[PDB]
Amino acid sequence: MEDLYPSRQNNQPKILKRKDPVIYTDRSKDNQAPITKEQLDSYEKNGFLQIKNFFSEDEVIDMQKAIFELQDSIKDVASDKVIREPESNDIRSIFHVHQDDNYFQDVANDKRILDIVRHLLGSDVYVHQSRINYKPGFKGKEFDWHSDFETWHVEDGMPRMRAISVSIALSDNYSFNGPLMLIPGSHNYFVSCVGVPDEESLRELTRIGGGISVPTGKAGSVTLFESNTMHGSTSNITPYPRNNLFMVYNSVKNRLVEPFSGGEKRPEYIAVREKQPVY
Ligand SMILES: [Fe+3]
């Protein structure tokens, strides 16, 4: 397992080009994809794709009800998968719902999602991680810019950029309430950290990308983004919440090995190492 993407090793950051395809299925096979050529081109160029109206209105309502019924059902639970705010003990995240809850397993297995990620990753996929995020109005701090791939590689042993994050908005997504922002085109550049990149690198990626992208849309809208697309968000100082369901689809050809940091494995609810049993 040669490290094609060393990071946190050198005390000096460096930008290296991408060594992996972005769209793994041949573009001559676009006809076979569940999304158009324009969508495919836009994913490839930008490192993300927003799809508004992915889910019907009843499905959105249902998912919104479901995350709050689950939150209530687990109020008394003691579990490292359940992230709570100290003081209020309010639940802010629940990991691994894709496996631990029937409803959310079905969402994670939604054919609409699987058909896209399988085409983009040019193989079958499995869920690397899932989480429900509860972000009430006025809650949730800033998250500095980062590449998920950098973390998955160094800390979880993901060898190659062959995963896709899928974010389902379960609250209306506005410009002003701390939405997810992304640097378009940044997926094509690996920023080796000395894992939050420095201002100079971010300036360089922004310049190349031409700007900053901020998908917005009503609850139910979906944003897919490539493993190495740089993203981040401001705090929310508004009463508009930002609840979401987040899943990561990894290619079955890119299963985790030991962390490239040389460090210990993180828990299964953070990074899946189970292989699906045949039964
Ligand atoms: Fe992230």
JSON list of N, CA, C and O in Angstrom, two decimals, residues 60-72 101 103-104 132 134:
[
{"chain": "A", "resi": 60, "resn": "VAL", "atom": "N", "xyz": [-39.81, 14.18, 1.53]},
{"chain": "A", "resi": 60, "resn": "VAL", "atom": "CA", "xyz": [-39.10, 15.14, 2.39]},
{"chain": "A", "resi": 60, "resn": "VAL", "atom": "C", "xyz": [-39.76, 15.22, 3.75]},
{"chain": "A", "resi": 60, "resn": "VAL", "atom": "O", "xyz": [-39.10, 15.14, 4.80]},
{"chain": "A", "resi": 61, "resn": "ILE", "atom": "N", "xyz": [-41.09, 15.39, 3.76]},
{"chain": "A", "resi": 61, "resn": "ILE", "atom": "CA", "xyz": [-41.80, 15.46, 5.04]},
{"chain": "A", "resi": 61, "resn": "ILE", "atom": "C", "xyz": [-41.51, 14.24, 5.90]},
{"chain": "A", "resi": 61, "resn": "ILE", "atom": "O", "xyz": [-41.26, 14.31, 7.11]},
{"chain": "A", "resi": 62, "resn": "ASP", "atom": "N", "xyz": [-41.52, 13.08, 5.25]},
{"chain": "A", "resi": 62, "resn": "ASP", "atom": "CA", "xyz": [-41.31, 11.81, 5.94]},
{"chain": "A", "resi": 62, "resn": "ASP", "atom": "C", "xyz": [-39.93, 11.74, 6.57]},
{"chain": "A", "resi": 62, "resn": "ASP", "atom": "O", "xyz": [-39.81, 11.31, 7.71]},
{"chain": "A", "resi": 63, "resn": "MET", "atom": "N", "xyz": [-38.93, 12.17, 5.82]},
{"chain": "A", "resi": 63, "resn": "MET", "atom": "CA", "xyz": [-37.54, 12.12, 6.33]},
{"chain": "A", "resi": 63, "resn": "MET", "atom": "C", "xyz": [-37.44, 13.12, 7.45]},
{"chain": "A", "resi": 63, "resn": "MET", "atom": "O", "xyz": [-36.72, 12.91, 8.43]},
{"chain": "A", "resi": 64, "resn": "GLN", "atom": "N", "xyz": [-38.05, 14.31, 7.34]},
{"chain": "A", "resi": 64, "resn": "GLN", "atom": "CA", "xyz": [-37.96, 15.27, 8.44]},
{"chain": "A", "resi": 64, "resn": "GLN", "atom": "C", "xyz": [-38.60, 14.73, 9.71]},
{"chain": "A", "resi": 64, "resn": "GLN", "atom": "O", "xyz": [-38.04, 14.86, 10.80]},
{"chain": "A", "resi": 65, "resn": "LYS", "atom": "N", "xyz": [-39.76, 14.10, 9.59]},
{"chain": "A", "resi": 65, "resn": "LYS", "atom": "CA", "xyz": [-40.43, 13.48, 10.74]},
{"chain": "A", "resi": 65, "resn": "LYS", "atom": "C", "xyz": [-39.55, 12.40, 11.36]},
{"chain": "A", "resi": 65, "resn": "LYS", "atom": "O", "xyz": [-39.41, 12.33, 12.58]},
{"chain": "A", "resi": 66, "resn": "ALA", "atom": "N", "xyz": [-38.97, 11.59, 10.48]},
{"chain": "A", "resi": 66, "resn": "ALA", "atom": "CA", "xyz": [-38.12, 10.46, 10.90]},
{"chain": "A", "resi": 66, "resn": "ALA", "atom": "C", "xyz": [-36.91, 10.89, 11.71]},
{"chain": "A", "resi": 66, "resn": "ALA", "atom": "O", "xyz": [-36.58, 10.30, 12.75]},
{"chain": "A", "resi": 67, "resn": "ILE", "atom": "N", "xyz": [-36.20, 11.94, 11.27]},
{"chain": "A", "resi": 67, "resn": "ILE", "atom": "CA", "xyz": [-35.04, 12.30, 12.08]},
{"chain": "A", "resi": 67, "resn": "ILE", "atom": "C", "xyz": [-35.47, 12.79, 13.45]},
{"chain": "A", "resi": 67, "resn": "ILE", "atom": "O", "xyz": [-34.72, 12.58, 14.41]},
{"chain": "A", "resi": 68, "resn": "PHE", "atom": "N", "xyz": [-36.63, 13.44, 13.55]},
{"chain": "A", "resi": 68, "resn": "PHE", "atom": "CA", "xyz": [-37.02, 13.89, 14.88]},
{"chain": "A", "resi": 68, "resn": "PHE", "atom": "C", "xyz": [-37.66, 12.75, 15.66]},
{"chain": "A", "resi": 68, "resn": "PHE", "atom": "O", "xyz": [-37.53, 12.68, 16.88]},
{"chain": "A", "resi": 69, "resn": "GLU", "atom": "N", "xyz": [-38.37, 11.84, 15.00]},
{"chain": "A", "resi": 69, "resn": "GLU", "atom": "CA", "xyz": [-38.79, 10.70, 15.82]},
{"chain": "A", "resi": 69, "resn": "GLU", "atom": "C", "xyz": [-37.62, 9.87, 16.33]},
{"chain": "A", "resi": 69, "resn": "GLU", "atom": "O", "xyz": [-37.67, 9.39, 17.46]},
{"chain": "A", "resi": 70, "resn": "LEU", "atom": "N", "xyz": [-36.58, 9.68, 15.51]},
{"chain": "A", "resi": 70, "resn": "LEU", "atom": "CA", "xyz": [-35.42, 8.96, 16.03]},
{"chain": "A", "resi": 70, "resn": "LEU", "atom": "C", "xyz": [-34.76, 9.70, 17.18]},
{"chain": "A", "resi": 70, "resn": "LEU", "atom": "O", "xyz": [-34.41, 9.09, 18.20]},
{"chain": "A", "resi": 71, "resn": "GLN", "atom": "N", "xyz": [-34.57, 11.02, 17.05]},
{"chain": "A", "resi": 71, "resn": "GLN", "atom": "CA", "xyz": [-33.98, 11.79, 18.13]},
{"chain": "A", "resi": 71, "resn": "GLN", "atom": "C", "xyz": [-34.72, 11.59, 19.45]},
{"chain": "A", "resi": 71, "resn": "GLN", "atom": "O", "xyz": [-34.14, 11.48, 20.53]},
{"chain": "A", "resi": 72, "resn": "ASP", "atom": "N", "xyz": [-36.05, 11.56, 19.40]},
{"chain": "A", "resi": 72, "resn": "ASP", "atom": "CA", "xyz": [-36.84, 11.40, 20.61]},
{"chain": "A", "resi": 72, "resn": "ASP", "atom": "C", "xyz": [-36.71, 9.99, 21.18]},
{"chain": "A", "resi": 72, "resn": "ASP", "atom": "O", "xyz": [-36.62, 9.79, 22.40]},
{"chain": "A", "resi": 101, "resn": "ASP", "atom": "N", "xyz": [-30.69, 1.57, 11.81]},
{"chain": "A", "resi": 101, "resn": "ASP", "atom": "CA", "xyz": [-32.10, 1.93, 11.73]},
{"chain": "A", "resi": 101, "resn": "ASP", "atom": "C", "xyz": [-32.67, 1.58, 10.37]},
{"chain": "A", "resi": 101, "resn": "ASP", "atom": "O", "xyz": [-32.16, 1.98, 9.33]},
{"chain": "A", "resi": 103, "resn": "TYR", "atom": "N", "xyz": [-35.39, 2.53, 8.71]},
{"chain": "A", "resi": 103, "resn": "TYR", "atom": "CA", "xyz": [-35.78, 3.63, 7.82]},
{"chain": "A", "resi": 103, "resn": "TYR", "atom": "C", "xyz": [-34.58, 4.20, 7.09]},
{"chain": "A", "resi": 103, "resn": "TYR", "atom": "O", "xyz": [-34.57, 4.42, 5.88]},
{"chain": "A", "resi": 104, "resn": "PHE", "atom": "N", "xyz": [-33.54, 4.49, 7.88]},
{"chain": "A", "resi": 104, "resn": "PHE", "atom": "CA", "xyz": [-32.41, 5.19, 7.26]},
{"chain": "A", "resi": 104, "resn": "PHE", "atom": "C", "xyz": [-31.58, 4.24, 6.42]},
{"chain": "A", "resi": 104, "resn": "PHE", "atom": "O", "xyz": [-30.91, 4.64, 5.47]},
{"chain": "A", "resi": 132, "resn": "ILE", "atom": "N", "xyz": [-26.88, 11.69, 10.87]},
{"chain": "A", "resi": 132, "resn": "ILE", "atom": "CA", "xyz": [-27.88, 12.76, 10.95]},
{"chain": "A", "resi": 132, "resn": "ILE", "atom": "C", "xyz": [-27.30, 13.90, 11.79]},
{"chain": "A", "resi": 132, "resn": "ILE", "atom": "O", "xyz": [-26.78, 13.68, 12.89]},
{"chain": "A", "resi": 134, "resn": "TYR", "atom": "N", "xyz": [-28.36, 17.42, 13.55]},
{"chain": "A", "resi": 134, "resn": "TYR", "atom": "CA", "xyz": [-29.36, 18.35, 14.09]},
{"chain": "A", "resi": 134, "resn": "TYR", "atom": "C", "xyz": [-28.66, 19.68, 14.34]},
{"chain": "A", "resi": 134, "resn": "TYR", "atom": "O", "xyz": [-27.77, 19.76, 15.18]}
]
